[PDB]
Amino acid sequence: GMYLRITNIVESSFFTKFIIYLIVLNGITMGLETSKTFMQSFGVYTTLFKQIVITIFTIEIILRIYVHRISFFKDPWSLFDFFVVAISLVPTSSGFEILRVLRVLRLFRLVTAVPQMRKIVSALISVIPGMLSVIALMTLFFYIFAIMATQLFGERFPEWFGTLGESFYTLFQVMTQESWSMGIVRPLMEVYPYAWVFFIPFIFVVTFVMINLVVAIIVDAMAILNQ
Amino acid sequence: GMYLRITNIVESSFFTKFIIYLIVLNGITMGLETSKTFMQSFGVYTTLFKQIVITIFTIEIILRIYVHRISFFKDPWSLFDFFVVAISLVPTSSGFEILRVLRVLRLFRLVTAVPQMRKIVSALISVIPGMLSVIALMTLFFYIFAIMATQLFGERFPEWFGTLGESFYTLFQVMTQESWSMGIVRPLMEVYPYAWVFFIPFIFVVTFVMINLVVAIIVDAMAILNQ
Amino acid sequence: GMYLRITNIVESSFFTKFIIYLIVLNGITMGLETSKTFMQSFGVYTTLFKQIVITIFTIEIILRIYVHRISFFKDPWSLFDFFVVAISLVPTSSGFEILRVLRVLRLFRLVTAVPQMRKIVSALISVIPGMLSVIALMTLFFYIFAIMATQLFGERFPEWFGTLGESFYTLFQVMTQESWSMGIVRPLMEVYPYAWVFFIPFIFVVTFVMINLVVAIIVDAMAILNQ
Amino acid sequence: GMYLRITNIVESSFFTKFIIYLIVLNGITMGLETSKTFMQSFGVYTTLFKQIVITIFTIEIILRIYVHRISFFKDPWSLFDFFVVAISLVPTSSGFEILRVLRVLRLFRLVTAVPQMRKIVSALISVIPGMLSVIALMTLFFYIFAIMATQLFGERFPEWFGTLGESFYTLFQVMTQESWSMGIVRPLMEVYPYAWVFFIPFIFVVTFVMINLVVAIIVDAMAILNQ
Ligand SMILES: CCCCCCCCCCCCCC(=O)OC[C@H](COP(=O)(O)OCC[N+](C)(C)C)OC(=O)CCCCCCCCCCCCC
Ligand SMILES: CCCCCCCCCCCCCC(=O)OC[C@H](COP(=O)(O)OCC[N+](C)(C)C)OC(=O)CCCCCCCCCCCCC
Ligand SMILES: CCCCCCCCCCCCCC(=O)OC[C@H](COP(=O)(O)OCC[N+](C)(C)C)OC(=O)CCCCCCCCCCCCC
Ligand SMILES: CCCCCCCCCCCCCC(=O)OC[C@H](COP(=O)(O)OCC[N+](C)(C)C)OC(=O)CCCCCCCCCCCCC
Ligand SMILES: CCCCCCCCCCCCCC(=O)OC[C@H](COP(=O)(O)OCC[N+](C)(C)C)OC(=O)CCCCCCCCCCCCC
Ligand SMILES: CCCCCCCCCCCCCC(=O)OC[C@H](COP(=O)(O)OCC[N+](C)(C)C)OC(=O)CCCCCCCCCCCCC
Ligand SMILES: CCCCCCCCCCCCCC(=O)OC[C@H](COP(=O)(O)OCC[N+](C)(C)C)OC(=O)CCCCCCCCCCCCC
Ligand SMILES: CCCCCCCCCCCCCC(=O)OC[C@H](COP(=O)(O)OCC[N+](C)(C)C)OC(=O)CCCCCCCCCCCCC
Ligand SMILES: CCCCCCCCCCCCO[C@@H]1O[C@H](CO)[C@@H](O[C@H]2O[C@H](CO)[C@@H](O)[C@H](O)[C@H]2O)[C@H](O)[C@H]1O
Ligand SMILES: CCCCCCCCCCCCO[C@@H]1O[C@H](CO)[C@@H](O[C@H]2O[C@H](CO)[C@@H](O)[C@H](O)[C@H]2O)[C@H](O)[C@H]1O
Ligand SMILES: [Ca+2]
Ligand SMILES: [Ca+2]
Ligand SMILES: [Ca+2]
Ligand SMILES: [Ca+2]
Ligand SMILES: [Ca+2]
Structure with missing residues (x-):
């Protein structure tokens, strides 16, 4: 196709660095939500933040699915990256409480995105066989x-x-x-x-x-x- | 001698794969017998199963003893394979309770039969000296x-x-x-x-x-x- | 400049061996101060000893800062050696109790001075990256x-x-x-x-x-x- | 000098194999003495046994000291072998109870005598420096x-x-x-x-x-x- 433009944006450094920044912001957010006092003070800004970040991540996954469709579902990092997105896509009252506790796994997307982290994780998996x-x-x-x-x-x-x-x-x-x-x-x-x-x-x-x-x-x- | 036939059956893949299938079925059986409710429901099918499998294993050991008599009692895997067969051959009321608990060791016959298992076990024994x-x-x-x-x-x-x-x-x-x-x-x-x-x-x-x-x-x- | 004299004294073996002897004497002193009975008997000799050793160490650090000024604050061993001196330089009633417990770290100056100790410590740090x-x-x-x-x-x-x-x-x-x-x-x-x-x-x-x-x-x- | 005879007996295999047999007999003896019932039955045979074995070991050490005097006190195995002999040479009522508990160390003479044991022990000491x-x-x-x-x-x-x-x-x-x-x-x-x-x-x-x-x-x- 703009297809070259969207594949030069998806594979751009800034796109993945931005979702890295979003991952870190969300991790701090998730850390703060355990405070019941912080949740009385700023319980609304954080939840709106969670909603805006989940939509960004879902469109980011949709774009990544588009630009290379066949590989996305034959690639382990992106497969997991798709699954943690999906698990937190189901609304918190639509699922059991355990689903809301699994939503925390969306921070491993940091291991998915950071290539030094990818290197070490696949090194440990390599040990396994x-x-x-x-x-x-x-x-x-x-x-x-x-x-x-x-x-x-x-x-x-x-x-x-x-x-x-x-x-x-x-x-x-x-x-x-x-x-x-x-x-x-x-x-x-x-x-x-x-x-x-x-x-x-x-x-x-x-x-x-x-x-x-x-x-x-x-x-x-x-x-x-x-x- | 049919001696060539019985030694081409004993050393056949299907014979040993079949006793492998029997070993796995017996392991699941032994697992289920710990359930007291399962033992109220199907306590008879499993015990008849145990009897038919013990007879199959005893004839299988008799055949294996026949086809290579001298080696069978100078070979560790088959020696053990003979001993676990014998231990469970003594009827459960003929022995002390501990004999019935030892009957569980008949599942290590899976290590005896599976050659990847043989490889690793003799690797650990090799470490020992x-x-x-x-x-x-x-x-x-x-x-x-x-x-x-x-x-x-x-x-x-x-x-x-x-x-x-x-x-x-x-x-x-x-x-x-x-x-x-x-x-x-x-x-x-x-x-x-x-x-x-x-x-x-x-x-x-x-x-x-x-x-x-x-x-x-x-x-x-x-x-x-x-x- | 006597600058050659003071740099041939600071870098002399006897100077550093002497502060090693002072470090060991101070370590034994610190060990004895935990005894409440020893502290009733000789509580004064040890405290005067602590004061005379802290002044010796402070002048020793001043000399070492002089003879090679730029390196002293770009060298880890001497940087730490300066910091533990400073921490115990603040009077014991000038700081919180925790400062007096940190004063014990002044015994790691033995690791700083002894070169076999330096070798092994930087070996462990070398492992870290x-x-x-x-x-x-x-x-x-x-x-x-x-x-x-x-x-x-x-x-x-x-x-x-x-x-x-x-x-x-x-x-x-x-x-x-x-x-x-x-x-x-x-x-x-x-x-x-x-x-x-x-x-x-x-x-x-x-x-x-x-x-x-x-x-x-x-x-x-x-x-x-x-x- | 019979000096050649006594040094061809001390360095004979049978002498050291015999004191090995005596060491093993004494170890079993020491094991049995913890039984209070065995000590009511055969408390006398074992104590006379302990006395006859201690005298044999003391004369054995005297001979070994004679045949190579200078080395015996510059050799670690024999030095220890001399010290455990001496510790149990002091009569049990001549020393504190702890001396009688140390007498058990006389079984390490088995490590002293057996050369495979010597090999492994000096291997561990070799690790130490x-x-x-x-x-x-x-x-x-x-x-x-x-x-x-x-x-x-x-x-x-x-x-x-x-x-x-x-x-x-x-x-x-x-x-x-x-x-x-x-x-x-x-x-x-x-x-x-x-x-x-x-x-x-x-x-x-x-x-x-x-x-x-x-x-x-x-x-x-x-x-x-x-x-
Ligand atoms: C990757 C690891 C980095 C390092 C992780 C740092 C973790 C820090 C944990 C220590 C914080 C907890 C200690 C503490 O006392 O905090 C109290 C609150 C919860 O209690 P709180 O709600 O304050 O008390 C309620 C009082 N009540 C019931 C009477 C109303 O608990 C809190 O206040 C929680 C404070 C939030 C800490 C968020 C730190 C995130 C670190 C950055 C990691 C991002 C990686 C992507
Ligand atoms: C290839 C990738 C690496 C993966 C290798 C790990 C393999 C793990 C095998 C685990 C298989 C057993 C699982 C299992 O049978 O679950 C049983 C229990 C669950 O207890 P459960 O009865 O559900 O508790 C309910 C309580 N109740 C009924 C009273 C209300 O749950 C447990 O007890 C589990 C406890 C840990 C079991 C560990 C079994 C041995 C694993 C050997 C690992 C290798 C180490 C060298
Ligand atoms: C090689 C390892 C593979 C993985 C191993 C899997 C092990 C699974 C263990 C977990 C099962 C136990 C959990 C549980 O709650 O089960 C309850 C029963 C026993 O209690 P139950 O008799 O149900 O309660 C009696 C109630 N009363 C007294 C009021 C009448 O306990 C049972 O129901 C036992 C269930 C049978 C499990 C058989 C699994 C075999 C795994 C395949 C291994 C074959 C390898 C050759
Ligand atoms: C070459 C192939 C590998 C095999 C190497 C393993 C060697 C193991 C040596 C064991 C020898 C000692 C056995 C023994 O003496 O049994 C004593 C106790 C039994 O207690 P017992 O008095 O029968 O309990 C009855 C209670 N009563 C009388 C009050 C009614 O039972 C115990 O206390 C046994 C406890 C474990 C003993 C471990 C001994 C050291 C083994 C060192 C292994 C190497 C590791 C580097
Ligand atoms: C590098 C490591 C070398 C080896 C370290 C040796 C450490 C020795 C620790 C054993 C000493 C403690 C045992 C003991 O019972 O001592 C009691 C005293 C404290 O109790 P104390 O004040 O005697 O009792 C008070 C009675 N009251 C309340 C009724 C008036 O506690 C003391 O007496 C303390 C004795 C001072 C030991 C100083 C040893 C320094 C070792 C040299 C290290 C220098 C390296 C630079
Ligand atoms: C690169 C050089 C090597 C350094 C690597 C070590 C990294 C350590 C990371 C530690 C980050 C977490 C620190 C932290 O968040 O502190 C939380 C707690 C403090 O509890 P806190 O709430 O302050 O207690 C007050 C009690 N209160 C409120 C009821 C009155 O304090 C703790 O719970 C700390 C417990 C230990 C945490 C260990 C975390 C995982 C470290 C993984 C190390 C690698 C091993 C393979
Ligand atoms: C190198 C290691 C080889 C393997 C080591 C084997 C160790 C065996 C330990 C197990 C024996 C203890 C178990 C037991 O129940 O024995 C009871 C006696 C002590 O109780 P006992 O005096 O029988 O009861 C008193 C009753 N009362 C108070 C009412 C009058 O306790 C005894 O009967 C002690 C039995 C003596 C065992 C001597 C075994 C020596 C092994 C060979 C080692 C030689 C290496 C140089
Ligand atoms: C080169 C060949 C290898 C040898 C290396 C081993 C070095 C061991 C150093 C031990 C130096 C400390 C000895 C010491 O000070 O003794 C203190 C305590 C004794 O307590 P004590 O006060 O006598 O108890 C009496 C109770 N009372 C007064 C209330 C009636 O006794 C203890 O607390 C001793 C506890 C173990 C101390 C371990 C110290 C660190 C050793 C680091 C080993 C290297 C591992 C990587
Ligand atoms: C048929 C098998 C043959 C038998 C021989 C196999 C050896 C078995 C040893 C007995 C097992 C008990 O295992 C016990 O585990 C503890 C764990 O804290 C060890 O404690 C450990 O400390 C350090 C630090 O990790 C280890 O590096 C070391 O291997 C071990 O000493 C004990 O020292 C060990 O004795
Ligand atoms: C400044 C220092 C830098 C920090 C990094 C150093 C690493 C320190 C790790 C934290 C220490 C806690 O150490 C804890 O010890 C237990 C002992 O049972 C380990 O348990 C162990 O099981 C197996 C079996 O022995 C070991 O081979 C393994 O090394 C370890 O996992 C825990 O997994 C480990 O976490
Ligand atoms: Ca433990
Ligand atoms: Ca443990
Ligand atoms: Ca342990
Ligand atoms: Ca542990
Ligand atoms: Ca431990």
Whole structure:
């Protein structure tokens, strides 16, 4: 087509720097809205601000959808950028409260826009694929010990191991090692005195696996450097 | 001998993929049996399912024992695969309850069958042999401090250090650092005010050794790469 | 100018070794002043000692400012060395109590003077610049989860998430993993039973990011060695 | 001189393997003596055993001192081997109870005798010298924050920060992160609401330094391999 003009504006630096400025202003706005006193004083300016920024972001997404239609929905950053826009597009009384809490995720658009942020985030995602083998191992391991722990402690201890889900949680807690013994294992042993046969091996296996996953991360990082 | 036929079926992909499907179905079954309501509704279909799958697995192990007899009992994956089959072969009322909880280990047959899982598990086992020197060091160290801590705190504090085993446990807990001070050392110091001479050095030695073991894992991994 | 004499004294070893000896004597002095009994016995000798050492340090800084004026205020070690001198130069009744507690920082002048200490400290500072990308990521992440957690739990749980700052703190605590579950998440779930959807993902993201930052430190260290 | 005979016996394998067997027998003995029931049954055989083994070890040390006099007291393994022998040589009623608890250290003679154990222990000691710079840094840092924390919280909180030593301990506890917040910082903030300015930076500095020390261990290990 002005199509060259609108694609030289959308891909212009000033357009994306401007929506960056709008993102930062909105983040401060969202920070201030937690103050109940600030919300008694300037509750109207901020909400009108939120409305004007949501409309700007929606037209900005419409333009970005136009200038490169096929890529926009095959590109992860813009896909997410479209989804957080959409989630906050549904009016706050049109959705459940949880939708209004998710609206906060619209600040990650700062990670979307800032290219140093893009670089680092896709670096962490890049780490993820090697870990799949040991994540699959470990979630099978957690499933098995959830099952055994439910069937072993979930009547005398229905608070912690009564369910499969409760056992998943208490096992994750034991894995992070928080309160693993004065909190879970010792009270257990007040009734089942060989409960440490279940948990001490569990601790050993889970910690060994975690260490090895970390070392794995490290060598995958280093191989691209020694080459 | 059909011996070529049965060894072209046992070593066929479909046979092992089928027992993989059976393993997954059984894992979901075992997951559902923890629900007491599901067990009131469909307690019979699942138990008949468990019986038909245990017979399939037992004939599958019999065939696998036949086609390569000598290797089957000199191969770790199949050895374990035989043992978990056997453990759940003993009827649930023929054994103690703990046997029924061990039956859950039959889901690790998924690690046995899936070759990506085999690769990663034998990778972790491969890590293990280098660690033997420092494991032997450390268990001697734990034995010595168990002994000293029992003889030092196990009358005024029989809950935690009254025995050698109780001291082993409380020392392992202090090693994982859980509640090491507000939980153990400080209550101790209410009666023995120099108890930190025992535990602070213990903490230092045990943490230093743990770090060094991890670094050791790392360099053993890296040497095979710089070569 | 004696200017050559005073610059051959300031840059002399004995001058800086002497202020090192004075720094150590002052550190022991500061250690002793916490004893209330020692302060009843020799409260006067130590305070006169503090006054004579502060005057020596102030003239030492005046000389060092003279011999190389332009560099002194463009050099970090001496800049800090000037600032800790100044902070304790304000009389103890001229400032708030917090100023008297900051006076203790005058012992880091030992890190300033000792060159092995300088080497190691600037080594740690040298590590810092690479971490900026992931620190910026993470503080955005903490800001977002502070906001969501305040809006989600800060009425039923005003102690922990009532404010943005309180939520920052409780989230940092959950990040260090201290008491994350028996302390925060479980009491929460007594009222909001899906609170683990908020915290378990938070734990996962924050731990993964921390691991990756550490690995990043490591590879940055190693690249200067494989080269 | 038989001097060749006694030096071909002392340096014989059988002599050192025999004292290894004696060390293991004594370790089991020491383990059994914690049982009060075993001590009612066989309290005499074990004590006579302890006496016969202590005499064997003392003559063994006398022989080892003879065959190479100058080296024995310039060699760390044998020096320690001499000292643990001496500590348990003082009769149990001739010393304080703590001496009888130290007698347990005579089991580390197993690390002294076993050469794989020697290899690994001197490997860990070998790691230690590089860490000196950051240990010296850190103990200065701990001294400074002990001082500030005593002067800041040791009247309203004399249990934890009343002394310099108590503050050292509570700071070490905060460093290991155990109960750092629900245990120390939060109760503090009930009276001093900006106590997190002191501890959150302390946590950050101490953790960063710890990470860097570990990375330092790692690169020192790796440089001897890339060479
Ligand atoms: C990216 C991270 C940057 C750094 C983040 C800084 C966060 C600062 C948090 C500290 C603020 C909270 C402390 C505080 O005491 O504030 C009180 C208010 C809420 O209480 P308030 O409503 O004042 O009290 C009500 C009294 N009542 C019930 C009797 C009527 O709470 C407030 O006043 C909230 C103050 C708003 C802080 C907004 C800071 C935004 C930082 C910029 C981040 C933009 C990144 C895109
Ligand atoms: C590939 C990308 C990375 C992703 C990898 C992470 C994989 C996580 C697997 C989680 C699968 C389990 C999820 C699940 O089954 O949810 C169960 C519970 C929910 O409890 P629930 O019963 O809903 O609570 C309601 C309370 N009620 C009924 C009494 C009213 O919720 C929990 O208990 C969840 C607790 C955490 C589970 C962690 C499981 C092991 C993950 C291993 C991660 C690898 C580390 C090396
Ligand atoms: C490998 C890991 C994959 C992901 C694992 C997913 C785990 C999901 C766990 C969450 C389920 C538990 C949550 C929940 O509230 O369920 C309740 C039931 C038990 O309570 P229920 O019997 O319903 O209540 C009794 C009521 N009474 C006493 C008054 C009669 O508890 C249940 O309903 C159990 C539901 C069965 C979940 C089975 C999921 C299997 C995942 C596939 C793994 C196959 C790998 C080979
Ligand atoms: C080579 C492959 C890797 C394997 C390496 C792991 C080595 C583990 C060594 C364990 C040896 C000690 C086992 C033991 O003596 O059991 C004692 C206690 C059992 O307590 P118990 O007295 O049975 O409780 C009954 C209560 N009662 C009598 C009052 C009714 O049970 C416990 O207290 C066990 C607590 C954990 C002990 C950890 C010992 C140090 C292991 C160092 C691991 C290396 C880390 C760097
Ligand atoms: C760099 C680190 C080196 C190693 C640091 C060593 C730190 C030693 C801390 C242990 C001392 C505290 C233990 C203790 O019980 O001392 C008590 C006094 C305070 O209580 P005190 O005033 O004696 O009791 C009052 C009784 N009343 C209320 C009834 C009248 O508290 C004291 O007596 C304080 C004793 C002063 C220790 C000064 C040590 C300085 C180490 C050298 C560091 C110089 C580096 C530049
Ligand atoms: C580049 C050099 C390295 C530096 C990187 C560190 C960045 C730290 C960012 C901190 C920004 C947040 C500061 C802030 O907003 O302060 C809020 C609270 C203060 O609570 P406040 O409301 O003042 O308490 C008064 C109580 N009242 C009102 C009821 C009377 O104070 C807190 O809650 C602070 C708690 C710690 C916050 C940690 C935030 C995430 C940092 C991520 C660090 C990277 C790790 C991978
Ligand atoms: C290097 C590490 C190897 C593995 C270490 C194995 C450690 C085993 C610890 C578990 C034993 C303790 C469990 C237990 O219930 O034993 C009870 C006794 C003490 O209570 P007891 O005196 O039986 O009860 C008194 C009853 N009363 C007051 C009413 C008269 O406590 C005992 O019976 C103690 C049993 C002695 C265990 C000796 C094991 C030595 C392992 C070999 C290490 C040699 C390395 C050089
Ligand atoms: C080169 C080879 C490696 C060695 C490096 C380790 C360096 C350790 C430095 C320790 C210096 C401080 C020792 C000290 O001053 O002792 C003070 C307290 C003793 O408390 P105390 O006042 O005796 O308790 C009596 C109670 N009373 C008076 C009320 C009846 O006892 C404590 O509080 C000690 C707590 C641990 C202190 C840790 C200090 C920082 C060490 C940094 C280690 C490096 C890690 C990166
Ligand atoms: C079959 C598996 C073989 C068994 C061997 C595997 C090793 C398992 C060790 C036991 C696990 C307990 O794990 C426990 O975790 C805590 C976490 O605070 C460690 O505390 C840690 O401090 C520092 C700082 O992070 C770490 O760098 C270090 O790795 C570790 O010492 C304890 O030192 C460790 O003992
Ligand atoms: C001026 C200094 C610059 C500031 C930057 C330095 C980083 C400091 C991070 C904040 C310190 C809190 O440290 C907190 O320790 C706990 C210990 O369980 C970590 O938990 C850890 O789990 C795994 C398993 O060990 C580690 O490999 C990982 O490094 C870390 O995530 C928390 O994730 C981390 O947040
Ligand atoms: Ca932890
Ligand atoms: Ca821990
Ligand atoms: Ca902990
Ligand atoms: Ca921790
Ligand atoms: Ca810890």
